[PDB]
Amino acid sequence: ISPPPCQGPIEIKETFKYINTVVSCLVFVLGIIGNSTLLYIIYKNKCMRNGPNILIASLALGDLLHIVIAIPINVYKLLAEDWPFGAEMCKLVPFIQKASVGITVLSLCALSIDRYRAVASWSRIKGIGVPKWTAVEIVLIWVVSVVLAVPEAIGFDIITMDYKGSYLRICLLHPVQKTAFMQFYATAKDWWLFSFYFCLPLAITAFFYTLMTCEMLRKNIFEMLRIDEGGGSGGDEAEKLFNQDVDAAVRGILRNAKLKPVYDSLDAVRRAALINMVFQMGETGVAGFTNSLRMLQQKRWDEAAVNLAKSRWYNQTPNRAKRVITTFRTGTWDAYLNDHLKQRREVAKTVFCLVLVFALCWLPLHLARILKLTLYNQNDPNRCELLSFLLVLDYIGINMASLNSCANPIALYLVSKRFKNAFKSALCCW
Numbered sequence: 117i118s119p120p121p122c123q124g125p126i127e128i129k130e131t132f133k134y135i136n137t138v139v140s141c142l143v144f145v146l147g148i149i150g151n152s153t154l155l156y157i158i159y160k161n162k163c164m165r166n167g168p169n170i171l172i173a174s175l176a177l178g179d180l181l182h183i184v185i186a187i188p189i190n191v192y193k194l195l196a197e198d199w200p201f202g203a204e205m206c207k208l209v210p211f212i213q214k215a216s217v218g219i220t221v222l223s224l225c226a227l228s229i230d231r232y233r234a235v236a237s238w239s240r241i242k243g244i245g246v247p248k249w250t251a252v253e254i255v256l257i258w259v260v261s262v263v264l265a266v267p268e269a270i271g272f273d274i275i276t277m278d279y280k281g282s283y284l285r286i287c288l289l290h291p292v293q294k295t296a297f298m299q300f301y302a303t304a305k306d307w308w309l310f311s312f313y314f315c316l317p318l319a320i321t322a323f324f325y326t327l328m329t330c331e332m333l334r335k336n337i338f339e340m341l342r343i344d345e346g347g348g349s350g351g352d353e354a355e356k357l358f359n360q361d362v363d364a365a366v367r368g369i370l371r372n373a374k375l376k377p378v379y380d381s382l383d384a385v386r387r388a389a390l391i392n393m394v395f396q397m398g399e400t401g402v403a404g405f406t407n408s409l410r411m412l413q414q415k416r417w418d419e420a421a422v423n424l425a426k427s428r429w430y431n432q433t434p435n436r437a438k439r440v441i442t443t444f445r446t447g448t449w450d451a452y453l454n455d456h457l458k459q460r461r462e463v464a465k466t467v468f469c470l471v472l473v474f475a476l477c478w479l480p481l482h483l484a485r486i487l488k489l490t491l492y493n494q495n496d497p498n499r500c501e502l503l504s505f506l507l508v509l510d511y512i513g514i515n516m517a518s519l520n521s522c523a524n525p526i527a528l529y530l531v532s533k534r535f536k537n538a539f540k541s542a543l544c545c546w
């Protein structure tokens with residue numbers, strides 16, 4: 117017997133009824149096949165199961181449970197223009213959904229941490245089967261996500277709304293909560309969702325991804341020099357001593373006037389090539405390539421490559437010079453590519469892609485909720501026009517956030533050739 121009143125929302129809600137229904141059905145089909153296939157693939161590859169990619173199976177299973185339970189209910193609700201179900205279903209759907217993105221949030225954090233740990237060591241000796249502590253991680257992730265979603269199950273209920281004489285059943289977080297905690301949860305829910313399900317995963321994953329790429333860069337520079345010196349051995353002690361020589365070499369470069377401008381201007385990979393040269397000829401010898409240094413300062417890669425090729429250094433040690441100059445030219449590790457550098461590159465790509473896909477899928481909806489919280493005043497005279505914009509962004513945000521439930525298998529297919537090959541075997545060859 118409770119009502120609402122305006123103008124702008126009406127046609128947007130009706131217009132988006134078909135958009136929301138189509139996106140949900142798309143997510144349902146793409147998500148059901150992609151995540152089932154992903155689970156199938158991950159557990160079968162015993163070298164995958166050995167390590168961090170078992171957390172990706174946790175991702176896929178959590179999204180699968182949301183897809184099979186919550187999305188059909190939402191489709192029925194959209195078409196019915198009412199909540200046709202009972203109170204139990206009203207409590208179940210938001211509980212399942214909140215638990216599922218919690219599993220996604222914590223799995224992505226765990227994946228970025230475990231990838232960082234793997235990079236930090238030399239001569240990694242893997243065990244057989246799922247590592248015991250990764251299994252503990254999975255249980256903990258799922259238990260915490262479920263406990264955090266419990267308030268949805270407690271708070272949601274069915275109420276009847278009267279809209280201009282028409283009665284509608286609506287499933288929502290009940291306006292009156294019984295306990296003081298549940299009343300606090302209702303007031304704080306919107307900020308809490310932004311904090312735990314958006315800010316926390318971005319903070320954890322950005323930090324550990326950054327640590328991981330920094331250690332990958334040091335190991336790649338270490339292998340670059342060892343390969344160019346005819347061979348050598350890695351390990352924590354060997355790397356630490358080498359890193360001190362690198363740090364000292366960069367300290368020298370920053371105190372020499374010819375080298376600092378080109379060094380500061382260069383990217384990380386191209387700085388390694390310049391450090392490589394400093395290791396071979398010393399600091400003053402590198403300063404001699406004024407024309408070449410100028411070209412690298414002005415980003416003339418091909419031009420700089422030719423000038424370096426025409427040098428005494430090139431004549432004496434051509435094989436090393438060719439590799440160094442390719443590094444300058446491409447800004448990649450392709451000339452020094454071995455299995456270690458190959459595996460480091462694939463690892464960085466998959467973690468980066470999954471986190472970025474999560475962030476972009478969810479950012480519009482979180483931005484919706486925030487703008488509505490801070491800005492929407494119904495007491496402001498032009499109340500209905502601002503609502504129209506927020507309602508449209510909220511609808512877009514809902515569909516884009518929903519896409520993340522099916523996006524990870526597709527992203528893995530597109531980014532990792534290992535996963536792409538495994539996808540083809542399971543689907544195209546079945």
Ligand SMILES: COc1ccccc1Oc1c(NS(=O)(=O)c2ccc(C(C)(C)C)cc2)nc(-c2ncccn2)nc1OCCC(=O)Nc1c(C)cccc1C
Pocket residue numbers: 140186187190206209210213214217287288309310313481482485513514515517518
């Ligand atoms: C961490 O979680 C969030 C963080 C920040 C903001 C929102 C967050 O989560 C939500 C979200 N949360 S909610 O507002 O508490 C809510 C949940 C369920 C329900 C019914 C349907 C049971 C009555 C009504 C309201 N609501 C919707 C929503 N979608 C459609 C209509 C009404 N509401 N979408 C979200 O994410 C979109 C992705 C998604 O998967 N949504 C979804 C889908 C696609 C189907 C079913 C249920 C849901 C929540």
Ligand SMILES: CC(C)CCC[C@@H](C)[C@H]1CC[C@H]2[C@@H]3CC=C4C[C@@H](O)CC[C@]4(C)[C@H]3CC[C@]12C
Pocket residue numbers: 134137138141142145146195
């Ligand atoms: C694998 C992918 C491409 C399949 C896509 C399935 C989508 C497009 C299908 C599945 C269910 C379908 C909906 C089911 C019922 C209705 C209600 C009707 O009043 C309008 C059409 C509408 C809204 C359909 C639109 C198309 C639809 C959403």
Ligand SMILES: CCCCCCCC/C=C\CCCCCCCC(=O)OC[C@H](O)CO
Pocket residue numbers: 130131132134135138
């Ligand atoms: C890449 C994935 C391929 C698969 C895609 C499957 C086919 C979807 C095609 C059309 C559905 C479009 C539905 C969304 C449009 C809703 C119509 C609408 O809102 O119309 C309002 C009207 O203009 C007010 O008068």
Ligand SMILES: CCCCCCCC/C=C\CCCCCCCC(=O)OC[C@H](O)CO
Pocket residue numbers: 181202204205208
């Ligand atoms: C794999 C993990 C997934 C976990 C999924 C849990 C599913 C069961 C829970 C709620 C469904 C409710 C069904 C709605 C029908 C209600 C009928 C009824 O009245 O009885 C049940 C109620 O608990 C007493 O009345």
Ligand SMILES: CCCCCCCC/C=C\CCCCCCCC(=O)OC[C@H](O)CO
Pocket residue numbers: 177178179181182212215216219262266269270
């Ligand atoms: C991704 C899907 C999540 C994984 C599967 C989910 C876990 C299912 C196991 C136990 C249910 C949770 C047990 C605690 C939740 C029940 C609490 C509750 O329902 O409260 C009733 C409320 O008080 C009435 O008003």
Ligand SMILES: CCCCCCCC/C=C\CCCCCCCC(=O)OC[C@H](O)CO
Pocket residue numbers: 255256259263295
């Ligand atoms: C792997 C390890 C698995 C560990 C598994 C942990 C499961 C959840 C534990 C604590 C969360 C519960 C904390 C909240 C307690 C609520 C107390 C309560 O229910 O209060 C009654 C209420 O006051 C009457 O109306």
Ligand SMILES: CCCCCCCC/C=C\CCCCCCCC(=O)OC[C@H](O)CO
Pocket residue numbers: 258259262263266270
């Ligand atoms: C294959 C599926 C895998 C699914 C794996 C999921 C693991 C969930 C395990 C324990 C969570 C139990 C949560 C218990 C929450 C206790 C607090 C509570 O229930 O509060 C109700 C409130 O008191 C009413 O008024």
Ligand SMILES: CCCCCCCC/C=C\CCCCCCCC(=O)OC[C@H](O)CO
Pocket residue numbers: 303304305307308311312316319
């Ligand atoms: C690595 C360090 C991470 C540390 C672990 C962080 C995990 C949770 C994240 C944010 C906490 C939630 C903050 C949100 C506060 C609840 C909502 C609120 O602000 O309630 C007050 C209300 O606005 C009055 O009107």
Ligand SMILES: CCCCCCCC/C=C\CCCCCCCC(=O)OC[C@H](O)CO
Pocket residue numbers: 307310311315316319
């Ligand atoms: C120097 C050490 C600091 C290192 C930091 C790393 C930890 C960051 C992790 C989570 C932060 C999440 C913060 C979420 C902020 C939103 C909370 C908020 O805005 O409060 C609501 C509103 O203001 C009330 O009315």
Ligand SMILES: CCCCCCCC/C=C\CCCCCCCC(=O)OC[C@H](O)CO
Pocket residue numbers: 465468469472473476477519523531
């Ligand atoms: C592309 C199809 C878009 C469909 C509709 C929008 C859906 C929005 C969700 C995700 C899009 C963003 C995903 C971006 C992933 C980038 C991965 C990447 O950049 O590769 C890593 C490498 O290190 C450098 O390329």
Ligand SMILES: CCCCCCCC/C=C\CCCCCCCC(=O)OC[C@H](O)CO
Pocket residue numbers: 127128131135139508512515516
């Ligand atoms: C996953 C991506 C989700 C898909 C997102 C696609 C972008 C939707 C933008 C505008 C459509 C709705 C705009 C409605 C603005 C006009 C509302 C109105 O009242 O117009 C009535 C007339 O029939 C028509 O304009």
